[PDB]
Amino acid sequence: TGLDDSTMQSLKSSLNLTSDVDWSNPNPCKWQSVQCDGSNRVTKIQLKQKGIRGTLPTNLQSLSELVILELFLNRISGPIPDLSGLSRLQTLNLHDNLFTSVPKNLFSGMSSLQEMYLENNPFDPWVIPDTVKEATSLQNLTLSNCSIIGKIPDFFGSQSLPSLTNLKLSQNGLEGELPMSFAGTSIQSLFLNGQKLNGSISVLGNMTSLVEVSLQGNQFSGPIPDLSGLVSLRVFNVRENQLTGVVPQSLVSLSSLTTVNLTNNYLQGPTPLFGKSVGVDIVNNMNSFCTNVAGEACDPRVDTLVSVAESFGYPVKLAESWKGNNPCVNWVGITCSGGNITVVNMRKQDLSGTISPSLAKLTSLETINLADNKLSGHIPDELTTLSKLRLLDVSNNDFYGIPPKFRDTVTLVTEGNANMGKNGP
């Protein structure tokens, strides 16, 4: 009476059905919580929260017309079998079982899949396979707490997964950087909290459909990008990272914003002042803001030095040290003669970037040593206005252009800059 009958017997044998599930009929299309279409092919199997033990039969993918498979909150163990024959499957919900592995070709063949929830299964550790690019209808993917390792694959772009909306990969063991193909996507919910992701979060600024993002508890560094395109952003949680730099005004000014968690980073400049409808999680002293008063301006020397750090790319080493509103109190590389900043010394600090023209606003400076780094660009002419400057040593970088003329009394060391004096087109 049906092409799926024999595979359904395999399923009935491999599951220890609880007792209020009646699968006794000779016709599996009449089984409880099983649905068939007009041609007697199985289209839905929905055994929700029954605590059922057993396994999945390895011929499950023979149910080629299966559309809905919901078995979450049971105690089903063993491997998840090959699912590539389930080309009409729209929903796969297996969360909170006892499955111990996923097929290595997961997503292959699954051209109708809209949503997949596997979270909280004790899987053997696995990398998200590149066959995820075959699940071109995917909208919801929750693989949180699934023992995933490796990197986020670069297959979440729009010409692969144009419908992807809710990507939840919380509490795995992912590492590495955010994929570039996140740029231009229409992901609306991104949960990557609680693992080992690192690098820059600038790609967020090209994710203009984002409504909710949590990067909480990773190793992201660098500044928060320009977010002025994220006109629907409501929840922004980047708690417990290594973010540095000034909180951009484009984030503080988003009218859609509802909730912001910045606690436990190395953010610099003034504590930001969000709108008063915003729930704000910024606990005193758990960043590197100049004061703990939201909206309070910094000391102008602090503003100047943060601009200097900006052109170094906001290194974590400076942000961890440059705390409070007085640069004369134990800031690394900063020496003062009673209130006046007199020395900026960052020799051999692996610095990349340029020298900010703002450095010339520290008008009491007597020595600048930036030797033995990886800086480039021009030496700013504004430095020649430093009337008390006696030594500018930029040895062993990659500066170019015309070296400015300092007064007779300034010692300028530019040796080791191969392209110094080169100023052609």
Ligand SMILES: *[C@@H]1O[C@H](CO)[C@@H](O[C@@H]2O[C@H](CO)[C@@H](O)[C@H](O)[C@H]2NC(C)=O)[C@H](O)[C@H]1NC(C)=O
């Ligand atoms: C994809 O995930 C979203 C959750 O972000 C689902 O939308 C929610 O569904 C629940 C049902 O459990 C409703 O109570 C919520 O009101 C929905 N929230 C919305 C619509 O913003 C959605 O159903 C999932 N599936 C698909 C196919 O999109």
Ligand SMILES: *[C@@H]1O[C@H](CO)[C@@H](O[C@@H]2O[C@H](CO)[C@@H](O)[C@H](O)[C@H]2NC(C)=O)[C@H](O)[C@H]1NC(C)=O
């Ligand atoms: C992110 O910050 C928000 C805002 O401070 C936190 O939301 C608060 O959570 C507790 C729970 O009762 C209460 O202080 C308030 O009810 C919430 N305020 C709101 C919703 O505006 C939220 O807990 C933080 N998230 C994390 C993961 O730490």
Ligand SMILES: *[C@@H]1O[C@H](CO)[C@@H](O)[C@H](O)[C@H]1NC(C)=O
């Ligand atoms: C994560 O999954 C494991 C099973 O591997 C489970 O014991 C644990 O409760 C899950 N954690 C959460 C927060 O659900």
Ligand SMILES: *[C@@H]1O[C@H](CO)[C@@H](O)[C@H](O)[C@H]1NC(C)=O
């Ligand atoms: C980020 O993590 C990867 C993988 O562990 C590592 O190879 C890379 O050097 C890290 N990058 C940064 C900037 O920390």
